From Swiss-Prot, chain B:
It comes from the Eukaryota. The chain holds residues 207 to 412 of 617 of the full protein. The modification Phosphoserine is found at residue 171. This is V-type proton ATPase catalytic subunit A. It is found in: Cytoplasm; Cytoplasm, Cytosol; Cytoplasmic vesicle, Secretory vesicle; Cytoplasmic vesicle, Clathrin-coated vesicle membrane. Phosphorylation at Ser-171 by AMPK down-regulates its enzyme activity. Belongs to the ATPase alpha/beta chains family. Catalytic subunit of the V1 complex of vacuolar(H+)-ATPase (V-ATPase), a multisubunit enzyme composed of a peripheral complex (V1) that hydrolyzes ATP and a membrane integral complex (V0) that translocates protons. V-ATPase is responsible for acidifying and maintaining the pH of intracellular compartments and in some cell types, is targeted to the plasma membrane, where it is responsible for acidifying the extracellular environment. The lineage of its organism: Eukaryota, Metazoa, Chordata, Craniata, Vertebrata. Expressed in brain (at protein level). It comes from Bos taurus. V-ATPase is a heteromultimeric enzyme made up of two complexes: the ATP-hydrolytic V1 complex and the proton translocation V0 complex. The V1 complex consists of three catalytic AB heterodimers that form a heterohexamer, three peripheral stalks each consisting of EG heterodimers, one central rotor including subunits D and F, and the regulatory subunits C and H. The proton translocation complex V0 consists of the proton transport subunit a, a ring of proteolipid subunits c9c'', rotary subunit d, subunits e and f, and the accessory subunits ATP6AP1/Ac45 and ATP6AP2/PRR.
UniProtKB/Swiss-Prot annotation, chain E:
It is found in: Apical cell membrane; Melanosome; Cytoplasm; Cytoplasmic vesicle, Clathrin-coated vesicle membrane. GO terms for cellular component: apical plasma membrane; clathrin-coated vesicle membrane; cytosol; melanosome; plasma membrane; synaptic vesicle membrane; vacuolar proton-transporting V-type ATPase, V1 domain. Expressed in brain (at protein level). Expressed in all tissues tested, but highest in brain and in adrenal medulla. One of its GO terms (biological process) is ATP metabolic process. The lineage of its organism: Eukaryota, Metazoa, Chordata, Craniata, Vertebrata. Non-catalytic subunit of the V1 complex of vacuolar(H+)-ATPase (V-ATPase), a multisubunit enzyme composed of a peripheral complex (V1) that hydrolyzes ATP and a membrane integral complex (V0) that translocates protons. V-ATPase is responsible for acidifying and maintaining the pH of intracellular compartments and in some cell types, is targeted to the plasma membrane, where it is responsible for acidifying the extracellular environment. The gene is ATP6V1B2. This is V-type proton ATPase subunit B, brain isoform. It is a peripheral membrane protein.
Length: 68, 199, 458, 45, 461
């Protein structure tokens, strides 16, 4: 009764220690460098909005220098 | 009488809201209840239960930027939507006013359909009635503010919206509440607002 | 009525940048006024006033500023806004983006002159679309069905067969009545043009097809008036000569790119991703010119194809066309890589007018319940296929092998049909029950027992 | 290896998908430790 | 320092665009000058001057710009910047966001006229905070205890009861009994009509209004008055503390609705929006109302702040709780996990922290076992939450006799210690006595963070 539960236990340990190491090494390092890509790409959408708004505030100043 | 839409109707005293607004849906009435005189926000034709019942006297529905063939179904079934009062099968267009505004209509008139439907709702508030306002898709109202502020060359907030977007929604949601109305016969009315956002 | 005063001609061009030509010393200029440019070489271009300020008028030329001078270029002002010569003889012709004939026929002899912006329909006198259009495609007719007078786009991408299923529902009009097709093509290739132009004559259906095709070598400013010329003849053949028009506005993402280039030439405040802030209004004026009115027995149905960039449904073009139109049809890339035609992810597809166009008198009785169950079975099966790759194949449930056996039968028998199968709607539901019969009862939760007992034991 | 488009709601979707897998180890580390604890005392028996 | 020159009244309005009114031909205009608009139909409005340029002065009207003409309106320049009428009889009065009384009372008799911007406290004059402020909540007084001068926010979300525990720690705040000059300045920014009515009718209906100075600012109030609301509330709290020498607690609720008003006026001055729409100077602007705290060297007064804010989408990387955690000194989380579980107050003490609680508690301050019963209740809470994840994948049988004792501690910690009820005022001694009734269900030698020099006196009972 202790031989048949022994050899079926390390059959269910290798299918669990692989599923733990499939998450720590394949699934989580794919998500944590996906999330590193969202932040670097959302910083570039803010500077493109920063450049479009500073372009307009430079144009609105020139039109207010004519009407003086 | 003639009243400007962007100016709040005067009143004697604002009162705390203590009576529930029974929507009829079981999750909205038991777990997360609304009261008459209170403000609500869903990410939303549907909501027929607000019309047939919910113990409110008049119903004012504002379709702010609603679609083409979905606006024409609201004004199609509302004349033949009936209810019971004391055993009489009575139609719901005796106590319903619609503010129909499709997105084909101009963008300056989309921001004025909200202020119109709350002024008619504050008018029937003053008679002692219990108004229930359903402002459909206020995200299209906030889209009309993004377009108008872009045409006047204004500086935006995050995601392109104008920076006074939080002060425009607050000037419409804070017009709803149970009150003691102005005038001598001592009556009390209320306005409930259910506004929709991006689903 | 008519204007008899002579047209003022100005040689006072004071600025050219991109698509825009800026005039000066103009005497009382209108807004949206059409201007006829006369080049020094002798060629003639058209224009349209975008902005007036005192005696200055900013026009947008339709054919481009390539060669436009500032000393010798004369611009005569047509004293009215852009009005189109329309007739019933345009059905069966080929025009370009500006309405000029391409098929080597004559120019149009007008029955009337109609404004391209359209007159606004009173929303109180607008009747509701309830007659169901049978398209022949099971992924449309069985799941996301289309009424008669419903605006409904086709969300696609670059490299997907959106032109193939645009011409398939164009020759399989169904209605269980000779739909007069008006076709607007903006930014299409010559391969896409010759695909559509040969399909309509191979079926012999170019007796009633009006092509408005604007290719990629054509200038981009003609794309701004291309859907408004296509719709102002579609609402002539629907509200005056009472036919049942079907309007196919393919590549609506090449319309919004033409709308950005003008909006970036005027240096206006841009909205999201460089598109103008008025792109929600400018799209809605050409989507809500649809539907059907109460005095006339004509109708107009819009199917605008648009290709979203980088498979993004949160891009500002397919995000704004979801708020105006009445449910989308999603063409998916991952179903196209598995060689399934048509590749239609029914999980983000939607038809907001399908609830009233099906039922007992419209379709047969079990339509509202087998479409309600095939969606919920596909969504859970798409969720148990994601955990099949992660944690194990047979793991944690044996009835999940029924959901994956549904996903193999749904994608290969229901939605995969080939480019010439015309499945009727009764043939669509009979395939739909064969995929629900591999599920047992008590798992078909969304079907009540008053309809589950008639069609499950078959 | 990236998955989808950055849209400021994909940042809060993927922070929840990270939250599912961060608690997927700590729920399965102890399951593999409960199996190892019985494995090391059965071997003594 | 009185000024006696008569005020000028200009009818020279030369431009209106949004909430700004542009004047012309102004004789030497001040920068932050307070002006008084007079409408053509007689209604009065106020306003701050926003930007001057030569003889042109751009004011922005408080109450809005509608109806303002260019020919018949008249603007009157009061020759000084915005001042505050401060007194000690503003303890028990309800003011709006601009300083006018709301509770049907008279104006304040103004025993001093102070500036709302103030001055920064000298770093050489500030002294370290020592004793404790009793809030009456066991999750705050027991395990995340606050000092006298500590700045500690309450990180909440939309829908969580951060307004209900703000009103709780205002009704029952005291120093410590220790067997005395205590005041509270409550500033509400961007609240509803229902939340403002709840704050007015909870403080006056509980006897607490002998020492509360309440500043409402509704959401239908002008958005410029949300900026001068924490500047009014901290000017008077610098008059009560270290000018009248009483220990003051300042509760600045909804600090996420303050910086939505700071973003609004930053677009009125035509500035380019910085990170996530918020302005670039928001770290300086938030720290000019947080760093008006702490104790001073020569005066017995003190001032401690609890700036309550709602982080959107439960995000800590948002600029509102990230630029607050850089300057404030430890946080308190109201979380959705315990709130759906119906636990009031829903304060989880595992991510919460008070950085100066090692100074606040002690032998002469509360009693000498507070340092160990807080460390032991926190260590037994992390284990009891860890073994509760073992109860589902292993089983209720296979876990040992130790892990069955942590699970019986967990159902009693979150029901007797944290779960309090909105009207139960527990002292700092009644908090620690509940803290020992949950440690007595363990045997000792499991209580490894408590030394035996303090385990012998308080365990056997």
């Amino acid at each position: 009764s202790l031989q048949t539960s022994f050899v079926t236990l390390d059959e269910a340990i290798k299918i669990t220690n692989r599923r733990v190491n499939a998450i720590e090494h394949v699934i989580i390092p794919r998500i944590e460098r996906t999330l590193a890509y969202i932040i670097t790409e959302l910083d570039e959408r803010e500077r493109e909005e920063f450049y479009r708004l500073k372009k307009i505030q430079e144009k609105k100043k020139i039109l207010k220098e004519k009407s003086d | 009488q003639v009243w400007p839409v962007r100016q709040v109707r005067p009143v004697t005293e604002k009162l705390p809201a203590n009576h529930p607004l029974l929507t009829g849906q079981r999750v909205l009435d038991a777990l997360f209840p609304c009261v008459q005189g209170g403000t609500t926000a869903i990410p939303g034709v549907i909501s027929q239960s607000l019309s047939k019942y919910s113990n409110s006297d008049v119903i004012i529905y504002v379709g702010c930027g609603e679609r083409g063939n979905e606006m024409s179904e609201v004004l199609r079934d509302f004349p033949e939507l009936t209810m019971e009062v004391d055993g009489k099968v009575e139609s719901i267009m005796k106590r319903t006013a619609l503010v129909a505004n499709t997105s084909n209509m101009p963008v300056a008139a989309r921001e004025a359909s909200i202020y119109t439907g709350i002024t008619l709702s504050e008018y029937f508030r003053d008679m002692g009635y219990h108004v229930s306002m359903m402002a459909d898709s206020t995200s299209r109202w906030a889209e009309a503010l993004r377009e108008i502020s872009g045409r006047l060359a204004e500086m935006p907030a995050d995601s392109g919206y104008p920076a006074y977007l939080g002060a425009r929604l607050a000037s419409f949601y804070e017009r709803a509440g149970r009150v003691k109305c102005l005038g001598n016969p001592e009556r009390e009315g209320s306005v409930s607002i259910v506004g929709a956002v991006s689903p | 009525n008519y204007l008899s005063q002579p047209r003022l001609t100005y040689k006072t061009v004071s600025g050219v940048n991109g698509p825009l030509v800026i005039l000066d010393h103009v005497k009382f200029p209108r807004y949206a006024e059409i201007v006829h440019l006369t080049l020094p070489d002798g060629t003639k271009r058209s224009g349209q006033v975008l902005e007036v300020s005192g005696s200055k008028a900013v026009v947008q030329v339709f054919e481009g500023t390539s060669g436009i001078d500032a000393k010798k270029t004369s611009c005569e002002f047509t004293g009215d806004i852009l009005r189109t010569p329309v007739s019933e003889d345009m059905l069966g012709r080929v025009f370009n983006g500006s309405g000029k004939p391409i098929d080597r026929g004559p120019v149009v002899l007008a029955e009337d002159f109609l404004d391209i912006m359209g007159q606004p329909i009173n929303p109180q006198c607008r009747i509701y679309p309830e007659e169901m259009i049978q398209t022949g495609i099971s992924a449309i007719d069985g799941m996301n069905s289309i009424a008669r007078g419903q605006k409904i786009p086709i969300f696609s991408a670059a490299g997907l067969p959106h032109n193939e299923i645009a011409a398939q529902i164009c020759r399989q009009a169904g209605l269980v009545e000779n739909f007069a097709i008006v076709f607007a093509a903006m930014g299409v290739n010559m391969e896409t043009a010759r695909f559509f132009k040969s399909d309509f004559e191979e079926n012999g259906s170019m007796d009633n097809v009006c092509l408005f095709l604007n290719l990629a070598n054509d200038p981009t400013i003609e794309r701004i008036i291309t859907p408004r010329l296509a719709l102002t003849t579609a609402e002539f053949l629907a509200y005056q000569c009472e036919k049942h028009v079907l309007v196919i506005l393919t590549d609506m993402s090449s319309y919004a790119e033409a709308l950005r280039e003008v909006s970036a030439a005027r240096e206006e405040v841009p909205g999201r991703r460089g598109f103008p802030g008025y792109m929600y209004t400018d799209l809605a004026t050409i989507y809500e010119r649809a539907g059907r009115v109460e005095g006339r027995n004509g109708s107009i149905t819009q199917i605008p194809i648009l290709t979203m960039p980088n498979d993004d449904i949160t891009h500002p073009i397919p995000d704004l066309t979801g708020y105006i139109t009445e449910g989308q049809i999603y063409v998916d890339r991952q179903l196209h890589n598995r060689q399934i035609y048509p590749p239609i992810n029914v999980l983000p597809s939607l038809s907001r007018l399908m609830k009233s166009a099906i039922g007992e008198g419209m379709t047969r009785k079990d339509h509202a319940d087998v479409s309600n169950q095939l969606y919920a079975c596909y969504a859970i099966g798409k969720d148990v296929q994601a955990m099949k790759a992660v944690v194990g194949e047979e793991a944690l449930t044996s009835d999940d092998l029924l959901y994956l056996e549904f996903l193999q039968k749904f994608e290969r028998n229901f939605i995969a049909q080939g480019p010439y199968e015309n499945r009727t709607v009764y043939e669509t539901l009979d395939i739909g029950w064969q995929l629900l019969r591999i599920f047992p009862k008590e798992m078909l939760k969304r079907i009540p027992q008053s309809t589950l007992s008639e069609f499950y034991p078959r | 290896r990236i998955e989808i488009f950055p849209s400021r709601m994909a940042q809060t979707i993927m922070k929840a998908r990270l939250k599912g897998a961060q608690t997927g180890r700590n729920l399965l580390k102890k399951k593999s430790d409960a199996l190892t604890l019985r494995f090391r005392q059965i071997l003594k028996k």
